[PDB]
Amino acid sequence: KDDFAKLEEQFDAKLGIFALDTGTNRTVTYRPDERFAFASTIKALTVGVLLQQKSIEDLNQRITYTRDDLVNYNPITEKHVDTGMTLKELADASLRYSDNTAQNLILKQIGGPESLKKELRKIGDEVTNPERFEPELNEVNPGETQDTSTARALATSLQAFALEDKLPSEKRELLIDWMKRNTTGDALIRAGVPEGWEVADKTGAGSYGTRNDIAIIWPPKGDPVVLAVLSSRDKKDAKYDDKLIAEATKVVVKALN
Ligand SMILES: *C(=O)/C=C/N[C@@H](C(=O)O)[C@](C)(Cn1ccnn1)[SH](=O)=O
């Protein structure tokens, strides 16, 4: 646990780590049960739940929306107000670009934050606590439990949809394929794994310099590793440093080797 403490001192941040080798049941933990704002990592679990409810052809359904439906950061969705987008394309934009309107439209389709919460409780996640849409969910103050979870619960919930029987294999593959092709995580978990390791991740960023990455990772040979790396800082307007997540990942890899 001293390598993580030194990282917490170097980057002046609090770290939350849970890693599991699905093949050996070896874990690496550090503040595994401390709450952090989940931020955009919730996008992964939201698509997890959508996949539970929608058939593949349901995903071809066109969703119309307006300029007023758009929020702060909509890289894909703002470009398609006139024509709408299929659920499939919204999931793609939400996961790989972290498009906030895409997320919000998907969350509405599943019934809103309380419905997402209920579905997570059903799969045994008693920790994750969604209450809000994007971008307001990204802002969580100290001591608050709204829109928070833990390294352990995020990893376990991600593990549930991507690797266990919470989704049938084809839908697992679809989720994994989107997350493999994520565009926002090059400097995080991806930067901390050895050459030839495959990564499917979702990133998050929030107030208090909160910087998260959750992933399934595959060594060259062997079973996948489930990893959540969460972080926050003590000032509301703090900047995060991606190098903290990359280095923490390197510690996880070393400890698992
Ligand atoms: C999901 O994690 C999306 C996060 N968006 C952040 C960000 O990228 O830092 C925005 C754009 C800015 N931000 C950070 C903290 N509070 N606002 S916004 O969508 O929250």
Find the structural class using helix and strand composition: alpha+beta
CATH architecture: 3-Layer(aba) Sandwich
Determine the CATH superfamily: DD-peptidase/beta-lactamase superfamily
Q: What small-molecule ligands were found? A: tazobactam intermediate
Mind telling me the CATH class?
Alpha Beta
Radius of gyration, Cα only, in angstroms? 17 Å
Classify the helix fraction into a percent range. 25-40%
Which geometry do the CA atoms define?
globular
The N- and C-terminal alpha carbons lie at a distance of: 16 Å
Keywords: Antibiotic resistance, Hydrolase, Signal
EC number: 3.5.2.6
Family: Belongs to the class-A beta-lactamase family.
Organism: Bacillus licheniformis
Q: Would you give an account of this structure?
A:
There is one protein chain. By secondary structure, the protein is of the alpha+beta class. It has one domain (1-257): Beta-lactamase (3-Layer(aba) Sandwich). The protein has eight helices and nine strands. The chain has helices at residues 2-10, 42-53, 87-97, 100-109, 113-122, 151-162, 169-180, 243-256; strands spanning 14-21, 27-30, 35-37, 62-63, 85-86, 148-150, 198-206, 210-218, 225-232. Helix 1 (2-10) runs antiparallel to helix 8 and helix 2 (42-53) runs parallel beside helix 4. It is globular. The two termini are 16 Å apart. The structure holds tazobactam intermediate. Tazobactam intermediate is lined by residues 39-40, 72-73, 98, 100, 135, 138-139, 204-207. InterPro entries: Beta-lactam/transpept-like, Beta-lactam_cat, Beta-lactam_class-A, Beta-lactam_class-A_AS, BlaC_bacilli. Pfam families: Beta-lactamase2 (PF13354). It comes from Bacillus licheniformis.
